[PDB]
Symmetry: C4
Subunit: 321 residues, 4 copies
């Protein structure tokens, strides 16, 4: 039946899976203690001002006032009371026992000031809990490479292969693969490149490196005249110092945040003359993917042990003679 | 007249269209009951603390106080009153009947604590109603494929074709098409690929797969020597087990979120020797698109019933002899 | 001197320039009247509830209460008072004259409910003023095409050219150009394509269509054997029904929102045998761009009046004989 | 050992490194004084209204009221008191001394109005402190070009080279390089291009311009028949007026904001017959990058002083004879 329903939906089911710009990430909870401190500082500061004012105006000795005398702020009898009024103003709780009066302009202006300050402050609190909210780090890896890469024969050509798959049913828009052989080398003129990155060809020029990934795919590198692996046999493989890097880029269907997935195979991690265990099965009305067979491989004794280079050379001696 | 006005505007009119990172999507309204619970828990907790304090300080028996005795918080006569003061503090309603006094530091500190807690809490409430606000799922599909794909003759070549169109007047920046024949196969060496994805060529190498989509377009795949459809005739079509996938990627003009539109044609869903009904008409000063003709097709009896492979083979026998 | 400073900075100066997902864009100010309505509805509803409660409990006739009788909410003497208490609760103004008491659980629960409701409501208000805040429409066009396109001779080849430029000093990351001849045509087999889009080659295959745009650039299309313009002379130009579309895509340096800039030239809008007036001048220590010369052009009488096709044909008759 | 751990992690360590849409960026702190003004204006306006009402209703002479007379708003004895009530309403502090009463509908409606206004206002305040919060300018440059570019011999070919490196351990998804020779020139037909941008080939056609950048890389431009540098020797280099631009695009792993890094080399800034000092060293279990050697270079006297053009020409005279 259908691999892709007419609406784009996929027919597969997955089984058996195991300046201050730095302030956005500024801290885990240290920002919370930071803001709690921000408040405390502002509350204590304005309380001291209100207490200074009540002290000077002489309210401390007549906090409630009377017919002849009106406090700047009612009911401030000390610094503790002062502290309270400041809080109630900024928090805008405003119980009202401590209350401003029309007497002192300085006091009124001070409330006016404290109100704006207070607003700005928690306004920023929402911004910091915005930044730190969505600006992640450590996004779960949705993509997977076979633990090993395989060298075997497919359709007459000798090929290095490895597997990639999505752990999520979510699609990868504009996905493409790359590979490089990495190793030190010395140029013809005797120049030293400590680690050289040599492209390994997955089909870029025809755009076959463009992939549609639903179920796990085996990526093919034909080893040929233009391959850095052209002169390598199965024995060389248990010798050589080279390492292969593999990449899969693309964009998460939901985010449109381009992703780059990486992994590596040492010469020692490449299994010659093997093949991957099929991960995809058809059961009646729909397709299943058994993810336990992902890394699993099996020997193909009929696989030639020599290098692709000698493989091709031999062909012509069986031609010429 | 003009297809594209000098300012970029398009001249067409459309007619007849029918960790906790998972918390962003955490729920529909279960988050609302979650937060309502968050509040309730904090309100009840602080009320119990205030009630514990009023109990110990002995306020329950003299809630209003007198000349010789001052409560930590005025007017707490029970747990219900206690509950109320907690609410009024956090909500910052602060009716003021239940009111803090300068007596108990513990109480003052508790208010101080409850104020910061309360702020943080709803600060987060705005973040959750941020995440859940714009982080969508199920974005309406703006793109469309003809229900069927057609095989006919164009400009001398035999071609598999299918239609794509935008349901919205909104443009697709950097849009491109891809296609693959999907089917099981067994390699020369006898290896089984359960479902193989073979590229179908829409013109990638010349970059003709890059498209400017205003009105609906017919996508052409020339069936030639290098096509997987090269050896297929009209009769094979009512036999074969293959399925074709089609893709259109690009980015919504507004969002710049790369989109990937999918659809499929079974061999059985491919109509041989047909053509699409034109969707675009010119009326005087501007262009119309009649979207009722989108999926509509018609027979072209002059269309050859054989495979493109034999089509080409025959040419040379009418050459040689 | 330098076009690009060693830090990447550019040395040019510019002169003489003239479900409810739809709710994000839901309205201009109709959303503001919407929310104002949202509040009003909630305020009136809860006030009616509080008034219902005060009515039943018999508070209307003893609003202040006394030694033997305690109202659910103090000082509710009517619906107007009721309305007020509801407001003061939700707004959390809480003057305190109308005040809740520990008597009626129903009332307490109602306050509890109204508090959460109120919070959720304006929480959403911040989300709507978030969506409608940054989710724009009508982004100012930063990119510009010469009003006309020119056909002239450059470096021995006959070429259709047109100009593009940035109105902003801001760079375009990964910018590239495309062009298409648009016109109706009838296929060899007699099929009608109402408007056909034919690629015009700006150098894609070598990736010369990739451009670095600081000062305005002239885009070149070599008219050759593979060009749809190959058979066109200056006289044909004052006849033909074809139109040319031009595109420039890329991403705004700041936004990384891919942009697609469009414009068109009718055959009648193409000026044959002309050239563009240079927009870029060097003055001593830095480069200026005079944007008044952008669309300006001048005749080049030495320009051949014939089609590039006959231009090439003639070459060989002056070869053969 | 490993360059890339099996999970994608990199094995290198770095050492020795030194309408109103314009309102988003509208100002540094001028927006803060703007909003503070926004509040003040609204507070003063509503206070004047409340004062107008209290004046007309005759409350000024009986602010507290009595058995026979009820003020619209209690305790407004002047404009200063009026100012206060307005503040306490909007801020929702609501001390309660100045308090609304059920008498004047006009007043009630006014409170109702002031409440919604107040909410909208600071709602917007959160949006402006949203825009101005994350919409940056001046993002730190994470990418680096060698101060100079080198011409030397590698693997038999004469090549212009320059270095690029990431200052951050953060990866660049889909990174690619470009280069252009920039200089004035006059066309065959005698047309003047003030500054011409000529592509310099870094391997685009094979997609070798696609790079995987962990440690700093040397970018190679083979100087050959198709190079604008083909006819240039070491002596020409101390003469010529040309400048070379270099670009590196790609997307920051975290942001997915495409970045374009630029830099330039004047003919005078190109060091002929040199090579770069290796920046990468292997110490036991892991790789180090010494960033002090980045710009450092050394002479290679064996480097030919002539132009690649004559280099190749000479080859055939040592062939022919
Ligand atoms: K209050
Ligand atoms: K309040
Ligand atoms: K109050
Ligand atoms: K190519
Ligand atoms: K409040």
């Amino acid at each position: 039946n259908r691999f892709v329903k007419k609406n784009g939906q996929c027919n597969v089911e997955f089984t058996n899976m195991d300046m201050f710009t730095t302030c956005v990430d500024i801290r885990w909870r240290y920002m919370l203690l930071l803001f709690s401190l921000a408040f405390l500082v502002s509350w204590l500061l304005f309380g001291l001002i209100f207490w200074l004012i009540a002290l000077i105006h002489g309210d401390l000795e007549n906090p409630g006032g009377d017919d002849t005398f009106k406090p700047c702020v009612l009911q401030v009898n000390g610094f503790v009371a002062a502290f309270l009024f400041s809080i109630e103003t900024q928090t805008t709780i405003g119980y009202g026992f401590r209350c401003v009066t029309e007497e002192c302009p300085l006091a009124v202006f001070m409330v006016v000031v404290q109100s704006i300050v207070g607003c700005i402050i928690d306004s920023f609190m929402i911004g910091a809990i915005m930044a730190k909210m969505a600006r992640p780090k450590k996004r779960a890896q949705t993509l997977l490479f076979s633990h090993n890469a395989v060298v075997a024969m497919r359709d007459g050509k000798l090929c290095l292969m490895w597997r990639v798959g999505n752990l999520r049913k979510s699609h990868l828009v504009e996905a493409h693969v790359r590979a490089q052989l990495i190793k030190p080398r010395i140029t013809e003129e005797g120049e030293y490149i400590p680690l050289d990155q040599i492209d390994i060809d997955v089909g870029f020029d025809k755009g076959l490196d463009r992939i549609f990934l639903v179920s796990p795919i085996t990526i093919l590198h034909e080893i040929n005249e233009d391959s850095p692996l052209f002169g390598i046999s199965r024995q060389d493989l248990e010798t050589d110092d080279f390492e292969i890097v593999v990449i899969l880029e693309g964009m998460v269907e939901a985010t449109a945040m381009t992703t780059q997935a990486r992994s590596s195979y040492l010469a020692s991690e490449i299994l010659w003359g093997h093949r991957f265990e099929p991960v995809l099965f058809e059961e009646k009305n729909q397709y299943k993917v058994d993810y336990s067979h992902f890394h699993k491989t099996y020997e193909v004794p009929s696989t030639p042990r020599c290098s692709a280079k000698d493989l091709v050379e031999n062909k012509f001696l069986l031609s010429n003679s």
